[PDB]
Structure 1
């Protein structure tokens, strides 16, 4: 079924309805399962992912369950290419959504976007599960405007060298703490740093972080102490939250449990 029963999904139950575009692994489609339930269908371009390791990890991913996590429904592996079937998010990726100026977001909405993501990351942290590529491009938005974290942990199976090398052109340099860029030290605290950059993206309505700097200049400057400026839409109290994620010492960065509590404190003042 879809989240029930076998997680090997029979592709004969799928109807393709619309092309959603292409992402890290190629073609993504919108469709229906057994004519009724909406799904997204990720078709995994051959040569782009470490499929055996992913399919093993998919067992772990099926056991994760949180409202603010894009649900993995299952896989279609008896065919070329394989398919990954997930929850459908009608409003697309958070980054594009932020950049659509027609929404005319209130800051109350932006704050709740941060809360949705932080809830999902608190859940993952309680499960000792790192995201490893948290960013607005990796969050999705459903028809109710709820933001959900997607593709958690998937960077471990990407085969593209430009994404894997810390100096590759596709590595998430602008979402990485210094200990990642200099030593490849990943931890919950590198996810924390990325969450700070994500809050900044949200309150900047989707601007690219450190836009005036190249990837190399960014890596050098944040390791010296350059930090992202406060976005105009972020109050001092909101900026303190995102800023706290960027401490130069990883153990001085908060947990996601603390960040959620800080976000709720600001929310509760409204």
Structure 2
């Protein structure tokens, strides 16, 4: 779990998107990593390590892997799976896409979230800005456990701060909409405060142009007023794979 920073080589400052930057390195001369800093005094060294251990046991191909941590200097740093094509949101906006590729992106994320659901691990901030794309165009979920969102939040979260797997389900629906809208911001004609109000009164996202009726049904199933009547990530993955068979 602990990392010696002398096992890091080929340290670089890379560009991502137009103005973004990433600290790149090689870990043990095999793994491409991004190096991220932990905010000082934001948690105990105890709390940090236990959370890092939970996160490192979360192993799935469509989760951005945490390879380890370094706590022997200030600030603490983490090293994560390097993702060449960067943020999914930026990726949606730049490029090109066939509708099959969009549904593939939804499947990738749904697999990741199915896994997290199976581990009873809540993401709490699922969104396109929190997904990354590798060189092969595979989408992976990131910014879980350690993180840096009204428009991604269900009523029960906005009103009562009730987080559950079903609040992640809701966010996933909004992420599907982000993907199929090619990276539009949800509820873009509303402010954060207006969004919270209107959502409580039953506002929902429109069907994106590129989404079929079946695709819309799936993302819309995520936005049921009652949390318990929203599907699971397993069900969603089934629904997505069925639509792939048909489309």
Normalising by structure 2, we get a TM-score of 0.94
Distance 2:20 2:173 in 1: 28
Structure 1: any 5+ residue segments left out of the alignment? 1-6, 157-171
Question: Is the Cα contact below 8 Å between 2:51 and 2:145 reproduced in 1?
Answer: no
Q: RMSD across aligned C-alpha pairs, in angstroms? A: 2.6
Distance 2:140 2:236 in 1: 17
- CA deviations on 1:48-76 (whole Å, 9 max, x unpaired) are 56654232111111111111111110001
1:211/1:16 Cα in 2 relative to 1: closer, same or farther (>3 Å)?
farther
- Following TM superposition, by how much is the alpha carbon of 1:15 offset from its aligned partner in structure 2, in angstroms? 2.5
- Following TM superposition, by how much is the alpha carbon of 1:27 offset from its aligned partner in structure 2, in angstroms? 8.0
Distance 1:93 1:266 in 2: 26
| 1:181 equivalent among 158, 182, 202 | 158
Aligned residue pairs, count: 247
- CA deviations on 1:84-140 (whole Å, 9 max, x unpaired) are 011111110111100103xx0001000000000000000000111111110011111
State the partner residue of 1:54: 48
- Following TM superposition, by how much is the alpha carbon of 1:23 offset from its aligned partner in structure 2, in angstroms? 13
Structure 2: any 5+ residue segments left out of the alignment? none
Normalising by structure 1, we get a TM-score of 0.86
Question: Is the Cα contact below 8 Å between 2:37 and 2:78 reproduced in 1?
Answer: yes
1:20/1:223 Cα in 2 relative to 1: closer, same or farther (>3 Å)?
farther
Distance 1:188 1:219 in 2: 20
Distance 1:45 1:24 in 2: 25
1:51/1:21 Cα in 2 relative to 1: closer, same or farther (>3 Å)?
farther
1:175/1:114 Cα in 2 relative to 1: closer, same or farther (>3 Å)?
same
1:147/1:210 Cα in 2 relative to 1: closer, same or farther (>3 Å)?
same
1:37/1:9 Cα in 2 relative to 1: closer, same or farther (>3 Å)?
same
Question: Is the Cα contact below 8 Å between 1:17 and 1:29 reproduced in 2?
Answer: yes
